[PDB]
């Protein structure tokens, strides 16, 4: 299997530099796009920075940008992220994820989920909206809403990210309503306008974690999360 492998994370000053890396082990990163995603403590995802597969092409997000660099190393089969004048808002976890080529789809939208993570590096310095929580027993049903615009959601491939405390996310469902291999089926994922839905029948425990919603945004030129759902079952 696969796997990438984060270092550098540390405690800095305001103004300090940190380079940040991923590492990719398995297979080679150079044929594959990818993404940054952190989330500081207590709040939920937000995209960063990623990079274009077959060409080199950064796109950065409003907050950091001029500020953090992505370059990759096709040699040391892994990709840096250069943070400089930190600020302590940047305090926060830090993932990278791969994108891999979705068979599926269509010119411009070849790449639009995450499906292999990292499993996290802390960086401490000195939009869509879903539901703040539901909650069922099990054998039960919920759907989770996500509700955006136009400019995201309407026009763009949605997918959905589960995660429990502590641990890095999982790719959940992907393209509106496919899902990867391993995933039980009581998952489902529809869109209808400008909102997709989230839907489990026949909970169970270990589904009790957040959910996070996401799309790629035409007029921002950004990633774009949800606020997150927690997931309660009456246990
Ligand atoms: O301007 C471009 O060429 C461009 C623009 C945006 C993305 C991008 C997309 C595009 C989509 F259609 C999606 O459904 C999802 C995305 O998700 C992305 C995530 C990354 O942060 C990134 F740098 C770029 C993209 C992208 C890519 O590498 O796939 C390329």
């Known amino acids: 299997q696969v796997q990438l492998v984060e270092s550098g994370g540390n405690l800095v000053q305001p103004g300090g530099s940190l380079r940040l890396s991923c590492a990719a082990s398995?297979?080679?990163?150079?044929?594959?796009?990818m993404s940054w995603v952190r989330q500081a403590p207590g709040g939920g995802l937000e995209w960063v920075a990623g990079?274009?597969?077959?060409?080199?092409?950064?796109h950065y997000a409003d907050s950091v940008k001029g500020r953090f660099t992505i370059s990759r190393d096709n040699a040391k089969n892994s990709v840096y992220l250069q943070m400089n004048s930190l600020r302590v808002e940047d305090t926060a976890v830090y993932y990278c994820?791969?994108?891999?080529?979705?068979?599926?789809?269509?010119?411009?939208?070849?790449?639009?989920?995450?499906?292999?993570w990292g499993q996290g590096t802390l960086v401490t310095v000195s939009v869509l909206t879903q539901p703040s929580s539901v909650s069922a027993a099990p054998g039960q049903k919920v759907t989770i809403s996500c509700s955006g615009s136009?400019?995201?959601?309407?026009?763009?491939?949605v997918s959905w990210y589960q995660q429990h405390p502590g641990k890095a996310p999982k790719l959940m469902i992907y393209?509106?309503?496919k899902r990867p291999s391993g995933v039980p089926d009581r998952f489902s994922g529809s869109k209808s306008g400008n909102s997709a839905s989230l839907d489990i029948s026949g909970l169970q425990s270990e589904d009790e974690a957040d959910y996070y919603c996401?799309?790629?945004?035409?007029?921002?030129?950004?990633?774009?999360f949800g606020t997150g759902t927690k997931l309660t079952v009456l246990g």
């Open positions: 393209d509106v309503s």
């Open positions: 398995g297979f080679t990163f150079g044929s594959f796009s």
């Open positions: 990079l274009s597969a077959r060409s080199s092409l950064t």
């Open positions: 996401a799309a790629w945004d035409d007029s921002l030129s950004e990633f774009l």
């Open positions: 994820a791969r994108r891999s080529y979705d068979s599926s789809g269509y010119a411009g939208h070849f790449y639009s989920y995450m499906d292999v």
């Open positions: 136009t400019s995201n959601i309407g026009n763009n491939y």
